[PDB]
Amino acid sequence: MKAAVVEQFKEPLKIKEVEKPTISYGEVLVRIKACGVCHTDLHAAHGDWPVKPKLPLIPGHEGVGIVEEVGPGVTHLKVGDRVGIPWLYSACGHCDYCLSGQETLCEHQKNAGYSVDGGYAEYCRAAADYVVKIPDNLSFEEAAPIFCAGVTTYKALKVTGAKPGEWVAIYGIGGFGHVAVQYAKAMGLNVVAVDIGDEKLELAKELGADLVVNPLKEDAAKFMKEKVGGVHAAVVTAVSKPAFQSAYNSIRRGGACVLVGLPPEEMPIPIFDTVLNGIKIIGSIVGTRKDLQEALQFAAEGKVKTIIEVQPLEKINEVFDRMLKGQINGRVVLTLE
Amino acid sequence: MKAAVVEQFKEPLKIKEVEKPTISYGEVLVRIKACGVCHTDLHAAHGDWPVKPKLPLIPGHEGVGIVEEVGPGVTHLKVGDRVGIPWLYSACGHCDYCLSGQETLCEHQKNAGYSVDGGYAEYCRAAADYVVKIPDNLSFEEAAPIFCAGVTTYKALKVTGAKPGEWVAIYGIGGFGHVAVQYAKAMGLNVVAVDIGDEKLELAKELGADLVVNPLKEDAAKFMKEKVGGVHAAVVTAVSKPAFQSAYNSIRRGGACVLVGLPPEEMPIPIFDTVLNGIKIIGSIVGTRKDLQEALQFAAEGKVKTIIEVQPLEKINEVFDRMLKGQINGRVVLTLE
Amino acid sequence: MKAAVVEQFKEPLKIKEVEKPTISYGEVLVRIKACGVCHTDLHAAHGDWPVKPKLPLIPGHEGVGIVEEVGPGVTHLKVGDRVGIPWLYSACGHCDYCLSGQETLCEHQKNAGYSVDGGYAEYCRAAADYVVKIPDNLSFEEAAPIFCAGVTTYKALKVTGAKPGEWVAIYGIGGFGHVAVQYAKAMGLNVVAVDIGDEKLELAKELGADLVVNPLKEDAAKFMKEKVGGVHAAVVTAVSKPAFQSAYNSIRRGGACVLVGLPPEEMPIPIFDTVLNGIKIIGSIVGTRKDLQEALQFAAEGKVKTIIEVQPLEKINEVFDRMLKGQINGRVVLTLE
Amino acid sequence: MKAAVVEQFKEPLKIKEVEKPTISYGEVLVRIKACGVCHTDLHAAHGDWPVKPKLPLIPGHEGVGIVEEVGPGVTHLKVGDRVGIPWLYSACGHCDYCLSGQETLCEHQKNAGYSVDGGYAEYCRAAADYVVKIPDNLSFEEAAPIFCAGVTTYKALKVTGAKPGEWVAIYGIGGFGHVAVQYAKAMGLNVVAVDIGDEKLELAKELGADLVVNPLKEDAAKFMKEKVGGVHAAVVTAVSKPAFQSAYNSIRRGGACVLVGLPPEEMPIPIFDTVLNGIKIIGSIVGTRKDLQEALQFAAEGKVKTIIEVQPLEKINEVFDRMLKGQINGRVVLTLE
Ligand SMILES: [Zn+2]
Ligand SMILES: [Zn+2]
Ligand SMILES: [Zn+2]
Ligand SMILES: [Zn+2]
Ligand SMILES: [Zn+2]
Ligand SMILES: [Zn+2]
Ligand SMILES: [Zn+2]
Ligand SMILES: [Zn+2]
The missing domain is CATH 3.90.180.10 (Medium-chain alcohol dehydrogenases, catalytic domain)
Known part of the structure; x- marks a missing residue:
């Protein structure tokens, strides 16, 4: 063989x-x-x-x-x-x-x-x-x-614990994000797609995404505020320092930030605000x-x-x-x- | 008045x-x-x-x-x-x-x-x-x-998800710490008290704490390990980067690390392990x-x-x-x- | 006035x-x-x-x-x-x-x-x-x-525990029933509409319902067996003795049978199966x-x-x-x- | 052999x-x-x-x-x-x-x-x-x-979903009941033992039970009312027509009735009251x-x-x-x- x-x-x-x-x-x-x-x-x-x-x-x-x-x-x-x-x-x-x-x-x-x-x-x-x-x-x-990338993404969405009617932000409309969006829709959710590429936000939108922002260009979290009251949860598919800081800030109090990427580096995360707002950060793969x-x-x-x-x-x-x-x-x- | x-x-x-x-x-x-x-x-x-x-x-x-x-x-x-x-x-x-x-x-x-x-x-x-x-x-x-101290600590314990039978580490046996241990025991849990003063550890034991370690001299995570197989959860009552770090490592996979202190700075979580081992990091007050x-x-x-x-x-x-x-x-x- | x-x-x-x-x-x-x-x-x-x-x-x-x-x-x-x-x-x-x-x-x-x-x-x-x-x-x-009708039916659907992808039977396609079907769908669910009028069943189908039965000329429970492997749950919107027994029997083991009607009489449950198959009977209004x-x-x-x-x-x-x-x-x- | x-x-x-x-x-x-x-x-x-x-x-x-x-x-x-x-x-x-x-x-x-x-x-x-x-x-x-006897009963207790601090009523301090009491105690709970024999109600109390009541002599449900506020859940260990009715009535609104018995007969449940009070009846074994x-x-x-x-x-x-x-x-x- x-x-x-x-x-x-x-x-x-x-x-x-x-x-x-x-x-x-x-x-x-x-x-x-x-x-x-x-x-x-x-x-x-x-x-x-x-x-x-x-x-x-x-x-x-x-x-x-x-x-x-x-x-x-x-x-x-x-x-x-x-x-x-x-x-x-x-x-x-x-x-x-x-x-x-x-x-x-x-x-x-x-x-x-x-x-x-x-x-x-x-x-x-x-x-x-x-x-x-x-x-x-x-x-x-x-x-x-x-x-x-199907399961990784689907399971992540179960893990956010967001329920039908609520809002998730998907960060990175690539190979994970692009399938995430569809699962979130099939799961009853309303989606915010977030990406630097204007064409990926276009794709996400045909794919069912309810709102797109491009976090350049303007302020992604301030838009999700704004708008939809801040999202219930975020899935990060390309975890990087700025990707995470964005997701983090856009999540409403009590919300979950689920991290699905596998980058070499350590974060960090704010401790004060995390305690004061009971934010949840969770790995899933x-x-x-x-x-x-x-x-x-x-x-x-x-x-x-x-x-x-x-x-x-x-x-x-x-x-x-x-x-x-x-x-x-x-x-x-x-x-x- | x-x-x-x-x-x-x-x-x-x-x-x-x-x-x-x-x-x-x-x-x-x-x-x-x-x-x-x-x-x-x-x-x-x-x-x-x-x-x-x-x-x-x-x-x-x-x-x-x-x-x-x-x-x-x-x-x-x-x-x-x-x-x-x-x-x-x-x-x-x-x-x-x-x-x-x-x-x-x-x-x-x-x-x-x-x-x-x-x-x-x-x-x-x-x-x-x-x-x-x-x-x-x-x-x-x-x-x-x-x-x-009561509510904060009690709540924190609930948020950990830990069910009667399971193990929690309480980090720091101060004002929160020593009440945290009592709520833990009252809730069905088994407790590892962790502190740098062997006096506090002695107090913990009086309060029901099942096992103590001090962390300088070993090594809490590995004690904890070794031992109870890693605790299902940790409640961290005085967050210094070393406390949170040990807390993080002592927690078994799937585990929840509940943060409860309010220090000023940011602390870095290793993304790679967090995703791989399904860790949860959670603020509560x-x-x-x-x-x-x-x-x-x-x-x-x-x-x-x-x-x-x-x-x-x-x-x-x-x-x-x-x-x-x-x-x-x-x-x-x-x-x- | x-x-x-x-x-x-x-x-x-x-x-x-x-x-x-x-x-x-x-x-x-x-x-x-x-x-x-x-x-x-x-x-x-x-x-x-x-x-x-x-x-x-x-x-x-x-x-x-x-x-x-x-x-x-x-x-x-x-x-x-x-x-x-x-x-x-x-x-x-x-x-x-x-x-x-x-x-x-x-x-x-x-x-x-x-x-x-x-x-x-x-x-x-x-x-x-x-x-x-x-x-x-x-x-x-x-x-x-x-x-x-909305809340009673929506809540009822939540209470069933049923998660996106799973199956519910909505029993009776009237005032509650026809709104239940729509909530069920919006919630990621697959729906078996069950009623005696073939007319209501047509209405259910327009409303998003995936499968119907009459029962009442087929067996409903056996239809659902068969088919979808038994439904994860049932919301029973007009509780008569027969509707309940049918609902009860259509549900797979572990299942939830959510009651929503308010009839005067009492309905008997088979203790022996309820225990053996871990069934749940729940009131919701x-x-x-x-x-x-x-x-x-x-x-x-x-x-x-x-x-x-x-x-x-x-x-x-x-x-x-x-x-x-x-x-x-x-x-x-x-x-x- | x-x-x-x-x-x-x-x-x-x-x-x-x-x-x-x-x-x-x-x-x-x-x-x-x-x-x-x-x-x-x-x-x-x-x-x-x-x-x-x-x-x-x-x-x-x-x-x-x-x-x-x-x-x-x-x-x-x-x-x-x-x-x-x-x-x-x-x-x-x-x-x-x-x-x-x-x-x-x-x-x-x-x-x-x-x-x-x-x-x-x-x-x-x-x-x-x-x-x-x-x-x-x-x-x-x-x-x-x-x-x-152990698991049936332990599991039953997890199923009630009652949490450290809350009250469960164990019905029948016999073979199952007497170990249930110990489990519920071990699980953080407060126990009501219910039994016809003073025999058992003495045993239960040695075994850790917080309160006892003979359904003789007097009204069990009204005693539990009364008192503790109505129990959060009841485990029924000897399911019989009047046992079940008692447990049912003593449970507070929203409460659970876990049935653990295997009796041959069907057994009426009130539908009206069950719906109006969102009561839960659940088999478990x-x-x-x-x-x-x-x-x-x-x-x-x-x-x-x-x-x-x-x-x-x-x-x-x-x-x-x-x-x-x-x-x-x-x-x-x-x-x-
Ligand atoms: Zn792959
Ligand atoms: Zn408010
Ligand atoms: Zn204070
Ligand atoms: Zn294994
Ligand atoms: Zn009305
Ligand atoms: Zn099997
Ligand atoms: Zn046996
Ligand atoms: Zn009130």
């Missing part, structure tokens, strides 16, 4: 033939139809995160395809089921986190396409209990990104199998559609390239068939 | 005769029997907060006493009712915050002994709807610190009229007692010196009879 | 001149532009409920209109503010219910057009803290059913001042429109006649100008 | 030597040290519940003992661990219920000592992922009842693995202790004799060593 191996950090990826994995108990082998690409893959190749991966490594925590074989004793999935292998490759199922509904946080979790081989290959071995069925009415192309079942169904119903550009496995290095100069419109799925 | 009065900032106050206030509609006239003192009264005195008070000012948002006359309109209180006047002097009662359970954040709120004359005097004019009744079984001197009633009732049942020292009004300045010098263990309550 | 007046029970009401009421401290005087009618106004008329009203009485708790004078004390309202007088005429605003978010349950509540004169007259005296403002963008005739504000805002944004028929005061008895005969489709709103 | 086999319904159980079971993948073999008996077991003998068991059957869903062998692939349990096999023998792990945290409700669940052999034998095959470790500081004797770990730990800390009478396997039929007569005080554990 063919794959895209990261042999050495920061080095271009090899598109070589590799040994096609074997499967023992409780596993499935999956023939990969597509696999979405996001910044996380790139950081895996560059090797520049506290915990770094084991080389060589096939990336892809957004791989989706067909269950080709089912190892001894797996019963809840049949050959030929349409299926996806999300970031949470496996978790213990036994610790407290797992028994709460926070398997996403399990200390002994293995991560797809980072600590084990993932979706940048023709085939992928997966943990049967931990793969998720893609519903019929939803294409492989479309589903792939629902596995990262990916989400539960159930979160994903739920996020996938919204897409399955037309309520959210991702802006994809298809590419083949071999153009991967060009796509990281591109990604690193920040020239990617939403998300890049890789075709394998 | 005599009062402690703030004439100029950073200047000794003047115990002196002033005008005994007149009452209008929905107001009551309270004869102060005792008033609590905390750092907040002092920051008023020094006038060093972003929104400074207007001089002259009688401080005290921890005053309790007897209702001497009802204003017209008020029908829910009678002459002789033992009552208190919280930091939350008044709220509009109509804004959205007021119709959630969030009067504490009302944009129109007035603050006792800050934006209006408070409890450092023989009498106080108060908004009837906003006074909280003291249970019969609890004395004036005991009740008074429950009006700030004081509480609802109902929060307070609940806070008060635990004390009535003898499940939390404050460490009070009683000084007469005339000694207020002497007490601010010992405050600046950091010498007050527990809480000082002013007497007025 | 003129009014429809209940002089003796079960007798036709007399349209006649009466005293235009005078206002004291904290009240306002509203000039009624329109007032909704519901079964509850008729149960007052017939005096057949456990706690009967004192005669003579002006019914109507869906009265909306212009504020014509502000009582002394009231500061949050001005003359010409378009306002409504909900069933919750007033509460003590001090008890525990009132300081949760449960004013709806206050032991001292007074009810509009039941314990005190209400909306069936040119003027009405109301408790200022308790009138709810009507959005600018919404007319009197539309607003008025939102003051009973009307809602908070804040509940209504939210209910009202959905209508302002055009997401729920009530089907109204307008009649002048003089035609009231003709409308109670059509009410008993069960002929009123949707809601009737009385005009007074 | 020897077991207590239900060969024919209602017929006395045969203590007979039977085939020691074998274990495959994902399973464990357990040597039973003890096994609690309760009403459920008896209803498996008598065969008188909607879904009846397959015969022969070895009852016991409170069996606790030692992991004698681990089947291929299990990794969390190790040979020699102390362990228990609760009512929920197994569930699918993949349906919605399972992924909410409602495995208790899974349509595909097997039940121990009912739909498969459980604890009334010397040995018991079990689903590795579904057994729970008994904490070290807790005897097999003490733990056995925590596996059914057993609970999650995590619910059970938590319930076990309270006992481990000496916060709840079960009143046990030990008996060997042979007197099992003597125990059902007394039980059907209702002369058992607390719970009967069977010894197997």
Whole structure:
């Protein structure tokens, strides 16, 4: 089978033939139809995160395809089921986190396409209990990104705890923001899109966003004041010092600021105002199998559609390239068939 | 009527005769029997907060006493009712915050002994709807610190989400700290007291604290760890960057780190861990009229007692010196009879 | 001023001149532009409920209109503010219910057009803290059913716990039913409309409802099995024994069955299944001042429109006649100008 | 090995030597040290519940003992661990219920000592992922009842949603009731014990209960009114027509009635009053693995202790004799060593 191996950090990826994995108990082998690409893959190749991966490594925590074989004793999935292998490759199922509904946080979790081989290959071995069925009415192309940025974003929106009728501010109408907006709408919310790019605010608006501001150009929080009483919550999709300061100020008292990005730097946050106004700052990323079942169904119903550009496995290095100069419109799925 | 009065900032106050206030509609006239003192009264005195008070000012948002006359309109209180006047002097009662359970954040709120004359005097004019009744079984001197330290700490504990069985770390065993521990135990929780004085830790243990550490010499997070598996939550009662930092690291994944102090500067949270481990950082101060009633009732049942020292009004300045010098263990309550 | 007046029970009401009421401290005087009618106004008329009203009485708790004078004390309202007088005429605003978010349950509540004169007259005296403002963008005739049907149904939907994506069954597509469906949709929900008239089911479908059943020629519970896997919840808007048993059986395990009707008799629940499957049976009526504000805002944004028929005061008895005969489709709103 | 086999319904159980079971993948073999008996077991003998068991059957869903062998692939349990096999023998792990945290409700669940052999034998095959470790500081004797009576009751208490400070009424200080009281105390609550026998009301008070009342002698609901203000919730441990009516009436408006009984009959509830007071009626039984770990730990800390009478396997039929007569005080554990 063919794959895209990261042999050495920061080095271009090899598109070589590799040994096609074997499967023992409780596993499935999956023939990969597509696999979405996001910044996380790139950081895996560059090797520049506290915990770094084991080389060589096939990336892809957004791989989706067909269950080709089912190892001894797996019963809840049949050959030929349409299926996806999300970031949470496996978790213990036994610790407290797992028994709460926070398997996403399990200390002994293995991560797809980072600590084990993932979706940048023709085939992928997966943990049967931990793969998720893609519903019929939803294409492989479309589903792939629902596995990262869909759930990440959807779950974030559940986490804001904003309820139908209330207002969320989405910060950054890129690959997260652009799908956030649709989820927030499908979730009963009124949206404020916030972005430096006048064309992204245009997109967000076709996408359902109720109000746009461009935080240049004028004052974003003073506009959300202003206007809508200040938003109930904000989702930050490109967390940076000024992105956060904005979200923070625009949120009404008691509001939540949910941070979904993964930047290297430490913040800071005002303590006085946070205490005086009981502001909530919360990290969230990916989400539960159930979160994903739920996020996938919204897409399955037309309520959210991702802006994809298809590419083949071999153009991967060009796509990281591109990604690193920040020239990617939403998300890049890789075709394998 | 005599009062402690703030004439100029950073200047000794003047115990002196002033005008005994007149009452209008929905107001009551309270004869102060005792008033609590905390750092907040002092920051008023020094006038060093972003929104400074207007001089002259009688401080005290921890005053309790007897209702001497009802204003017209008020029908829910009678002459002789033992009552208190919280930091939350008044709220509009109509804004959205007021119709959630969030009067504490009302944009129109007035603050006792800050934006209006408070409890450092023989009498106080108060908004009837906003006074909280003291249970019969609890004395004036005991009740008074429950009006700030009690509610603030109790509320903080509720906001943590922590359920009977779970673990909290209380950071700093001072005025808030030592009452925080008692509320924690009364609420089903298991407690790790954390402080730099081994004396405070000894006091914590007396108050029910399950486990102590001091933090210089190890290392709280890792003790805590090691050990209870990391606490479900932390309440930080004196926020220095090192306290908040340890608080942050001791908290297990999914955990809530409730901030309760009001220091001037900003403190930096590491975005990457905050997102990855689903951390919550939350500000909280004081509480609802109902929060307070609940806070008060635990004390009535003898499940939390404050460490009070009683000084007469005339000694207020002497007490601010010992405050600046950091010498007050527990809480000082002013007497007025 | 003129009014429809209940002089003796079960007798036709007399349209006649009466005293235009005078206002004291904290009240306002509203000039009624329109007032909704519901079964509850008729149960007052017939005096057949456990706690009967004192005669003579002006019914109507869906009265909306212009504020014509502000009582002394009231500061949050001005003359010409378009306002409504909900069933919750007033509460003590001090008890525990009132300081949760449960004013709806206050032991001292007074009810509009039941314990005190209400909306069936040119003027009405109301408790200022308790009138709810009507959005600018919404007319009197539309607003008025939102003051009973809207909140009761919207709240009811919230109380079910059902989150965006999940399924509810709205049982009975009448005055409540047809507004329930619209709220349900605006709230992110998927809706199974259930009624005996195939006509109502067509109406439901126009209103946004995803699936209908009759039951009553199919099995409804089994339809819902089947289908959607059983609904997360049911709001039962006309509680007859059969509707309840059907509702109860259609709900999936863990489910909530929210009751909203007020029939005289008792309905039996199967203790053994209720425990085994963790079912919840919950009563809900009307809602908070804040509940209504939210209910009202959905209508302002055009997401729920009530089907109204307008009649002048003089035609009231003709409308109670059509009410008993069960002929009123949707809601009737009385005009007074 | 020897077991207590239900060969024919209602017929006395045969203590007979039977085939020691074998274990495959994902399973464990357990040597039973003890096994609690309760009403459920008896209803498996008598065969008188909607879904009846397959015969022969070895009852016991409170069996606790030692992991004698681990089947291929299990990794969390190790040979020699102390362990228990609760009512929920197994569930699918993949349906919605399972992924909410409602495995208790899974349509595909097997039940121990009912739909498969459980604890009334010397040995018991079990689903590795579904057994729970008994904490070290807790005897097999003490733990056995925590596996059914403990959780059912602990969980019930979480479900009431009552919080530290509030009041719950435990109805029936028998087998469940007597441990409920301790749990509610441990959970921060204030308890009202309600029982016909002064016997039990004395026991309850030793066990921590704040107030008692015999529904003889006098009005239970009016006493609770009265007094405490009406309880926030009631757990009903012996559901009967008049028990339930009492709990119902004593609950304050907004309160919850958690039913924990398994009586054969239907049971009227008032609809009018339920709606008007937003009352909640909720079935609950057993609970999650995590619910059970938590319930076990309270006992481990000496916060709840079960009143046990030990008996060997042979007197099992003597125990059902007394039980059907209702002369058992607390719970009967069977010894197997
Ligand atoms: Zn990704
Ligand atoms: Zn785990
Ligand atoms: Zn204070
Ligand atoms: Zn306000
Ligand atoms: Zn009505
Ligand atoms: Zn009240
Ligand atoms: Zn049992
Ligand atoms: Zn299941």
